[PDB]
Amino acid sequence: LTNSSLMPTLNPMIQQLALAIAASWQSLPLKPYQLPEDLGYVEGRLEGEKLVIENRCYQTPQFRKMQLELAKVGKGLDILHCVMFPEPLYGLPLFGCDIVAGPGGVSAAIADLSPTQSDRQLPAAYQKSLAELGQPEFEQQRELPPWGEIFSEYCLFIRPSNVTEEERFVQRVVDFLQIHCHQSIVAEPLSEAQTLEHRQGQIHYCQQQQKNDKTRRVLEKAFGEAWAERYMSQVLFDV
């Protein structure tokens, strides 16, 4: 991220989270994952503000696709997007987060380890480790939209009320990542039937994420409907 031209210009909480995700991934057995058209930097404008996106994407033997996206609309709107898609073979949940900020501060901060099992439960080891963290206190909880049924009971979705809350949220994401990295080492490869069940969970996650009109409208205002549909369905949430 020392290469990133966006990084210095993003909201501080976004910068801290980007750093924490990069630190988590840094020493993994990474290889690039080529996004469609080998996408890296992209920008677009139509009738309004310009949208700029830096797309980073990797894979490891355990993670089919690990994506970190940093974006800015004009000077008014900063976004961090991250998903780790695991190889269904290993039955790991989906780490994801999304942070949206403007000049007033962070408006939305979401993070989760989302289930892929048909029973919509996290694996037992994750349930146990996540419970041990204790329920965080946040002053300004937000209720997930209907498509958000995909998220676990541990999902965070807040407007951070102050710096203390910003730092508490980032630390909980660091904690989720530490659990996830550890559980990735200690799983326990699954049956062919179980592998299928997990693959299905991931497809469902992607289909539901594509119902988010908040993302879609930002993309559409800069690039148009067709571009946004391709980006959401082929670049971000590839089924």
Ligand X SMILES: C=CC1=C(C)/C(=C/c2[nH]c(/C=C3N=C(/C=C4\NC(=O)C(C)=C4C=C)C(C)=C\3CCC(=O)O)c(CCC(=O)O)c2C)NC1=O
- Positions touching ligand X (CB under 6 A) are 69, 71, 79, 81, 83, 96-98, 100, 107-108, 110, 112, 144-145, 148, 157, 212, 214-215, 218-219, 236
Binding letters toward Cl ion, positions 127-166, x by CB under 5 A? ------------------xxx-------------------
Which is nearer to ligand X, 112 or 190 (by Cβ)? 112
C-alpha distances (whole Å) from 127 to each of 178, 232, 234 are 14, 30, 31
**Nearest distance from C-beta of residue 30 to Cl ion, angstroms:** 34
Q: Which is nearer to ligand X, 62 or 208 (CB)?
A: 208
Query: x/- site string to Cl ion, residues 86 to 125, per CB under 5 A?
Result: ----------------------------------------
Quick one: angle between helices 12-25 and 163-186, nearest 10? 20
* Residues 6 or more apart whose Cβ sits within 8 Å of residue 212: 145, 147
Q: How far apart are CB 199 and ligand X at their closest, in Å?
A: 18
Closest approach of ligand X to the CB of residue 53, in Å? 7
CB burial of 129-149 (b: ≥16 within 10 Å; e: otherwise) equals bbeeeeeeebeeeeeeeeebe
Residue type, 136: P
181 HSE (CA, 13 A, CB side): 15
Residues, the chain: 239
Q: Say how far apart CA 132 and CA 58 lie, in whole Å.
A: 30
DSSP state of 190: -
The item of Cl ion, ligand X, none sharing an interface with residue 146, based on CB under 5 to 8 Å by kind, is Cl ion
Q: Which does 71 bind (CB under 5 to 8 A by kind): ligand X, Cl ion, none?
A: ligand X
Q: How far is the CB of 212 from ligand X (least distance, A)?
A: 6
The interface partner of residue 97, options being ligand X, Cl ion, none and the CB cut-off 5 to 8 Å by kind, is: ligand X
Distance separating alpha carbons of residues 167 and 173, to the nearest angstrom: 10
Least Å from the CB of residue 62 to ligand X: 19
For residues 69 and 165, which CB has a smaller minimum distance to ligand X in the complex?
69
If one asks whether residue 74 binds Cl ion (CB under 5 A), the answer comes out as no
Please, is 44 exposed, middle or buried when counting C-beta atoms within 10 Å of its C-beta (0-12, 13-18, 19+)? middle
